[PDB]
Structures are given as C-alpha cells and as structure tokens.
Amino acid sequence: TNLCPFGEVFNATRFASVYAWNRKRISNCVADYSVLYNSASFSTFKCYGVSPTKLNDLCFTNVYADSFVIRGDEVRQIAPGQTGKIADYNYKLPDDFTGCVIAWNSNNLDSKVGGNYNYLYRLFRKSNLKPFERDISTEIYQAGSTPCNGVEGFNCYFPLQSYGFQPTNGVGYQPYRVVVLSFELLHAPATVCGP
Amino acid sequence: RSTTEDLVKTFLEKFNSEAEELSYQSSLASWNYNTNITDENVQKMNDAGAKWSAFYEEQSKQAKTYPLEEIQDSTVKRQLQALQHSGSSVLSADKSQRLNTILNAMSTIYSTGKACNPNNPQECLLLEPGLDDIMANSRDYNERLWAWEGWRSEVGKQLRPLYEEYVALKNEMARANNYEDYGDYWRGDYEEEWTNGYNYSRDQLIKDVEQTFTQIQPLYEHLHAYVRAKLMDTYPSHMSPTGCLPAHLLGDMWGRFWTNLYPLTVPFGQKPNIDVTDTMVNQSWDARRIFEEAEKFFVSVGLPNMTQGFWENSMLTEPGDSRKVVCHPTAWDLGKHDFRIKMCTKVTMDDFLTAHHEMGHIQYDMAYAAQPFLLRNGANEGFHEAVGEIMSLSAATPKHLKNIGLLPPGFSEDNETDINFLFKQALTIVGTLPFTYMLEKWRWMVFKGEIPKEQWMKKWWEMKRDLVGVVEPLPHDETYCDPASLFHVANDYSFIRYYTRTIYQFQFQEALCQIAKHEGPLHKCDISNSSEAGQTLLQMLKLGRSKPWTLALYRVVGAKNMDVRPLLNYFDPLFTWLKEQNRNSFVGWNTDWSPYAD
Ligand SMILES: *[C@@H]1O[C@H](CO)[C@@H](O)[C@H](O)[C@H]1NC(C)=O
Ligand SMILES: [Zn+2]
C-alpha cells in the first residue's frame, strides 16, 4: 500500500556528482528489501555493521540514501577505512558505518559517446573530509605559497575535476551509481520499525 | 611550509587527471581513424591529437619549473623527469620550425621516393610494395642491383643535404638539453641514474652492446659462411668464397633481415616446416577462435583473461562494411583500461602466432595499467617487443601445437625439422644483429662528430664490411646517404631497440623455460600450462616504468645486464650443425674484396 520511494532513489533519472551527492531521508513508509538483495542487477551489495538477515527486529528513526556516480575503480573506496580521492576529498564513510553500500554499473545510463562530463569530483582539498561531510566549495586550490587571487595559474588548480565517461572505457573507468543506505537511531519514538 | 616534492605530486595529480582524458580522446580519435579511414576522422584525430600535444607541451614547460634534484621519491622523480623532457622546444623558434621542415621533408622523400628501372624508363616503383617485392623475391643479380642502387641514388642523395642539416640541428637540440650529442640523447632511453645497485649509463650502453656483439660473431661467422656458400650456388659469379656478401643479395633492400634467404639457403629443403594453416581451416577455426585460443595460452600461464570491452571494441577482423582500415597488427592501450587489437585476422598460422604476439602487448598493457599515466610503458624501448616476441616462441613450438590439437597425437618431431626451424630463426634473429649494431654505431659516431661529413659513406661501407661482412655492389662518393635510405633513419627513430630487444627476448625465454622445468633443447620449450613461468613474467610486466630496466630484467632472468649466451643457447643445436657444415668452407670474410673491383 504505502511503499517507500526506493524506486525514486534507485531509478532516479539523474544522479548527483560525488562531491555534491544527494541525500534523502526515507521515512514514514514501509521498506521492501526483497527486490534489493534478490536482484542480480547490483554488482556490489557490501553491507557493513548489519546483515540483511535479522532485519525485522531493529528500529531506525530514518533512512538516508546517499546517491552519487563514481568510477568502477573507485567503488572499492566507498567503505570504512578506505583511502583515495573519493574517500578523502569527495565522500568519506565513517568507520562505525552501519548500512549497505549498493553499487551497479551505469555505463548504459551515465556514459555517452564522446564523454559525459556532468559528474565532477573534488580533485584537490586542503584536508580530508569528515564522515558524511559534503563540500561544495569551488575556490582555487593553492599548492605552494604563491597566492592565486581567484585565477588558476602555476601551483593554482581548480579543485573540481570532471569524470570522463565513455561507454567504451574499461570496467574500472566506468560510471557506477552508488547508493549508500545509512540507518540512524536516536531517542526518538522510532515510529518506522518494519514488521 | 611545503616541500617541492609535494608541489610536483599535486602538479602530477592535476596533470594525470587531464592527461588521462586528453590522451584518451587522442587515442580514441586515432583508433576511429585507424578503424575507419575518412577525411572527417583525420581532422578529428588531428584536432584531438593537437589538443593533447599542445597540453603536454604546456605541462612540460611548467614541469621544468621544478628542480629535479630536490626529489627523494623514485616513483615521483621518474614521472617528472619523463615530463621535463623538453625536446626540440629548447631550440629557437627559427630553428625549431626549420627542424620540423627538415623532418617532414625527409619523411615525404622516403614515403614518396621512386626508383626507376634503367632498362624500362617508365618503371619507377615506390619502396612499398614495388621495390620491397623485388628485393624480397627476385633472384636476379641485375634486378636486385638497380632496385638497390636506384633507391639510394634517387632517394639517398635527396636526403644527404637534409641529413647534414638534420645532424646539426639535432645535435644543437641535444646539446641544449645538456647532452653530448644527439646519439647520447638517444642512449638516454637506457640510462638509469637513481636506483643504486642498478644504475645504467649512456656510455655503458656502447660498452655493453659491443660486448654482446663480440660474442655473436662466431655464430654469425658460420651463419654468414653457410649463407655465402649456399649463395654461391645461386650466384656463381659476382661473389667470392672468402669475401663479403653483396648488399643487394641479402634478404631485403637494406639487409636488415635475412628471412627471405630461407628458400635459397634452407638446410633440408625436402622436409617442410610445421604449417598448421590447413588443419585450422579443417577444424572450423575463425578469427574469434584464434584469439580465444591465444587467450587460453595466457590463461594457462596464469595471465588474466581478455576484458569484455576487448571483445566488444577490438577490430579482430576486417569489417564487411565499406569502411577502409589499415590493419597492420597493433595492440592499442587507449586509456581508461580500454585495450583493443585491430588485425585483419585470416585463418593462417602466421596470424595465429601474431595473435599471441599482439595479445602479449595487451597483457603487458593490462599489467601496468595500475601504474601512473607517465609510467605506463615498457621498462625500456626494447622490453615491450621482447615480451610479445616470446609469446610467439612458445606458441610456434610443436609441443604447444600438439596440445591444442593442431598436430596429430602421434606426430613425431624430426631432427632435420629442428634444423630447418632454427635456421629460419637465425636468418631473422641473428642475421639482423650485426646490421642493427653497425647502423647505430655509425649514427652514434656521426652525431658524436667522429665521422666528418666527407667520410660518412667512407666509414659506412668500411664498417658494413668489417662488422656485417657486407660489401657495397657499387662504390659511393659521399654524395649518398645510404643509412638514410632506411625508414628509422629518415624518420627519426632510434634503432638500437631492435638489438637489445633480441637480447632481452631469448634472455626472458631461457629463464621462463627453466622455471617451467623444461628438459631438452631451448628451442623446443613451451611455457604453456606453467603458472610459475607466467607469474614470474607478470612481476616484471606490472612494473612498467616504475623501476629501472636493469631492475626489471633481473626480476625475470636473474641477470642485471644483457646476456647473449641465452641467444647462443637457443641456436646452439644450429651452431653445432653450422660448424660441422663449415668444415670444408672458409669461415670469415676479407674487407679487400668488392664486387666492383673486377
Ligand atoms: C528500479 O526499476 C526496476 C525496473 O524498472 C525494478 O525492478 C526495481 O525494483 C526498481 N528499484 C527499486 C529500488 O524499486
Ligand atoms: Zn610488436
């Protein structure tokens, strides 16, 4: 009757960039996970903290779905303790991560002949991101001590780089829509539990 | 505040992100042109190519703003040093455009030169396929003579004034790059200066190429003598049993390979070589199965399978559509883990063997795909072809062909077939080593200024007689540029890679076969179904340019430097046969004799 809008999340016509990943709070609904783990369309279902079994006995206040597109080679970086450009500069998962990371190749959707550069990743940052932190700042990155004055010169680099996504790239350099389900519990009454 | 090692790392990360995309567009555009020859694709390839070329020069100029000595990371320094190679940029704008005018003029002369038959006036022929057919199949002394002399009179004389200006500008470019000369610049491909215990010098290359050449002379002397004795039957006159070999009478136009002398000089002509072409067509083999069986070869030794994108994107056969494709067998590392092979694969044994060769290039490309963008190459300029060449060695052996059912189970190898096989390998492998050594020795000294311009052709033909046992059919009077008649000399290509690769080739094979527990002659070895051999080779393949070639070579063969004993061991059954066949023949040559002396 009242199903959660997981279709509007997984089957969304367009995903956000990894640096500006879109977060949705799925609540006030009944979630059906049968079409998730029993579906062969997902090339990655590495779930951390909790397992798909023994799921009906847990209550979570809200469900957070972090949707973004990254390279296939960078799918391994969406995991606690990982190191890389995506892990440190774009999207960092907490070490105490409780949720399932769902990824699947989107070469048919997110790759075009000639390149699809609508997805950008923060190539440079002054420090590593905090867990679940989103950084949309787009100021010129200073490598050395020479000021940049808002224009990119030498040792002055624009922090955002655009993914080149062609359908002919190798499976490592291919778009992978990653949906990270984060389950949060607090002192709330926890209306949404799941029978 | 921040070390210069961090600045170059950040510079490399910015470079790598944009180099990956721009090179891929250049690589993808070049692939589209190579798999579809249309005028629009040429402009698309050039615009994509020029954008990548312009970007690289901009980054190279910025890379030279960082001090190279103030770097402690070996991996980072190799990337910056590769990027800091200014090249012809150091020349003035006046000279730089003049140099490119000279280089393009020589390439156009070489690709549009036409030697003309003196007897038939309107019989001018291009090198390919016109003069190459004459120099590879004809057995007439005069027919091979005018084609040989015509190519050097018509084209070499048009390259002599250009080559003299070419030498002066390339030396000025090299001396601007703090090199002794342009030859020293070319020897920098083998130089390793930062890994203690594996350092290699540009001068050490001369001392090592010379050392290996003095060890192949006795093998080459008997091969030279046996070929000369057999060529006496084909050419009773115009040759001397104690003299040298006329230059035109060799396998091809320059004598680079003796492979086309196999019919004239075959040891046992009554017993043919192993040819599985007929069996493949009788077993319903297609281009897909050739690359599938080639893939099975690398899986048996433990190398990874071909990617799914490889099968979807590669042009493994000539299309049935009307699109024009030049299908010289090449392996493509476009970028973004996009590995493709384009080949007009027919159902033949040669296409079966080169499928393992080209897939050997792809397996090399797949291995160092995890290396940074600037470190995705072979250990040196001779490693990439050495790895591909040893794949055809194992595939062509009767042991391998019997396992894949291309030979009858009861097929028995003959001793007079191993001799015929080894002799045909010596024509290509051993017949080219003196030629390759002499040509690079000449250019190194010409660039060094040891050969004055009034003695270029005087020392070219005195070294071709002393080192190669090859004598000019007709005298030349310094108005020629005989070396410039070759592709790699007119088109600015280093030629020593064809020498070191041959040494690396059998050095790899000898080591891999010992790991494969091969018992018997080395030329009978097949590393198939030997995961130990494949994993040891894969260790060097994954290195790319991250490590010096001296360190990469040692990880496979256990020897830091080039060793030619593995090459001598490969032809040892033939060398024993050659020395027994040369008991009643004179081994060696005298420089005094020339075809035109009388
Ligand atoms: C997305 O759509 C497919 C088919 O349209 C469906 O099988 C799948 O369940 C949908 N995703 C979700 C999360 O419902
Ligand atoms: Zn090759």
Numbering used by the authors:
A (entry chain B): 333 to 527
B (entry chain A): 18 to 615
From the paper:
The cellular ACE2 receptor is one of the key determinants of the host range. We found that ACE2s from sperm whales, minke whales, dolphins, sea lions, fur seals and hippopotami could efficiently bind to the RBD of both SARS-CoV and SARS-CoV-2 and facilitate the transduction of SARS-CoV and SARS-CoV-2 pseudoviruses into ACE2-expressing cells.
We prepared complexes of MW-ACE2/SARS-CoV-2 RBD, MW-ACE2/SARS-CoV RBD, SL-ACE2/SARS-CoV-2 RBD and SL-ACE2/SARS-CoV RBD, and solved their structures at resolutions of 2.87, 2.93, 3.03 and 2.89 Å, respectively. In comparison, E38, Y41, Q42, K353 and H354 on SL-ACE2 form an H-bond network with Y449 and Q498, T500, Y449, G502 and D405 on the SARS-CoV-2 RBD, respectively, while H354 on SL-ACE2 is not involved in an H-bond network with the SARS-CoV RBD. E484 and F490 on the SARS-CoV-2 RBD interact with hACE2, and S477, D405 and G504 interact with SL-ACE2 but not with hACE2. The Q24L substitution decreases the binding of SL-ACE2 with the SARS-CoV-2 RBD, and both D30E and D38E confer longer side chains. However, the side chain of E30 is bent and does not form a salt bridge with K417, while E38 forms an additional H-bond with Q498. Transition from G354 to H354 confers an additional salt bridge with D405, strengthening the interaction. However, in the SL-ACE2/SARS-CoV-2 RBD complex, L79Q and M82T change the hydrophobic region to hydrophilic and push F486 away from the binding surface.
